[PDB]
């Protein structure tokens, strides 16, 4: 029955990441069971673009990419092939012709502490839309005007990143829903993640 891959600690990790700086983990050379995730679990919004979640275990691909991040509650439908908005156009540009299924489960027990939980960040100002699968870990001052501004704040010269305003009782509309999006790959290489 050989060895598995640590999907458990990928999902059961304590602190995942911020949205504008999403992580990666190349997963290969084991067996994986994409069945325990959907057969009986509390993961709401198990949308499964690409191939339908049924009969998913049998098909085998070369490598598996895992991406993780935290976003707002009501702002989860924007992360999909296409769609426009403040997200998915400045932080996570998901390309068309996508492969892989997305998991987005709600969480209000390890986040939004009592009082004010101001620790997560998301990019708010950018001069152009993101290229497919592009992450911009930058802090440089945005130039919104026609006059150079040298590391100062003022008119037509702002700060790119902004902090989330998660509150313990703000409402179901705005809660931190931890979202993990997978992917797939298959090219001229013997596939390894063939988990029956």
């Amino acid at each position, epitope marked *: 029955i050989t060895n598995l891959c640590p999907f458990g600690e990928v999902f059961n990790a304590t602190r995942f990441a911020s949205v504008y700086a999403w992580n990666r983990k190349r997963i290969s050379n084991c067996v994986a069971d994409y069945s325990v995730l959907y057969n009986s679990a509390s993961f709401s919004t198990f949308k499964c673009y690409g191939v339908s979640p049924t009969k998913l275990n049998d098909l085998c691909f070369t490598n598996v990419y895992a991406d993780s991040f935290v976003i707002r509650g009501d702002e989860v439908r924007q992360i999909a092939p296409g769609q426009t908005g403040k997200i998915a156009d400045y932080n996570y540009k998901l390309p068309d012709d996508f492969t892989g299924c997305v998991i987005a489960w709600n969480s209000n027990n390890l986040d939004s502490k009592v009082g004010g939980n101001y620790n997560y960040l998301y990019r708010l100002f950018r001069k152009s839309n993101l290229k497919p699968f592009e992450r911009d870990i930058s802090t440089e001052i945005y130039q919104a005007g026609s006059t150079p501004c040298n590391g100062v704040e003022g*008119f037509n010269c702002y700060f790119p990143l902004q902090s989330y305003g998660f509150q313990p009782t703000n409402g179901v509309g705005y809660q931190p829903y931890r979202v993990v999006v997978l992917s797939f790959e298959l090219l001229h290489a013997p596939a390894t993640v063939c988990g029956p």
Partner: antibody
Amino acid sequence: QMQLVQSGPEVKKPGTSVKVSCKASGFTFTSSAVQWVRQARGQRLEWIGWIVVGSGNTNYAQKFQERVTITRDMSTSTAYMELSSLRSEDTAVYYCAAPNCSNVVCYDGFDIWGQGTMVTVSS
Amino acid sequence: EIVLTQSPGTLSLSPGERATLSCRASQSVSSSYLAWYQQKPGQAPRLLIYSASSRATGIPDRFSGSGSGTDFTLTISRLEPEDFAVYFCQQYGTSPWTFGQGTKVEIKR
């Protein structure tokens, strides 16, 4: 055409609050800012502060650190101003300002101005 | 301190005038964030010149004026009879964005 719309006059009493709305239209309101001034009857202009419509930036005058909060709002693409504890010396005319910014580039001057409300505290 | 006092008290000349206006500031401000406003009594002010040496969307009579870190000026060559109102300085380089005293113009009879 592109313009700015402001609320109507109000009459209040000493010891209450007010609200003034700047319903921007005709331009991309998301990337802009609003400045608030206060003119008296034939006197010099003053300053009250400003907010960035991009949210998360307020800067008030020293003498008006308290008594005023500039809420922003985004659903109706307007801007609100609230001045509390109105006193007899606050009888004046209130204005509105913003730069004519259109997507790529923001115009560097407060080109557009509001019609101007009016408040009168009395007995 | 941060003040925007203006040298001329009032001006009174018939149509046709150099119309030199001075706006001597006190603290060093970079000549990048400064504007001039005109307020015809009975309505809201209008923007005339922004960023010291530039022009608005549209202005007649070719309003001109440029300065330095601690000195600015505005001149109106051949002052048109229609233009007669109060002119206000303004700086927004650093908080607070203190305004100016303002000057007044008139004709002679």
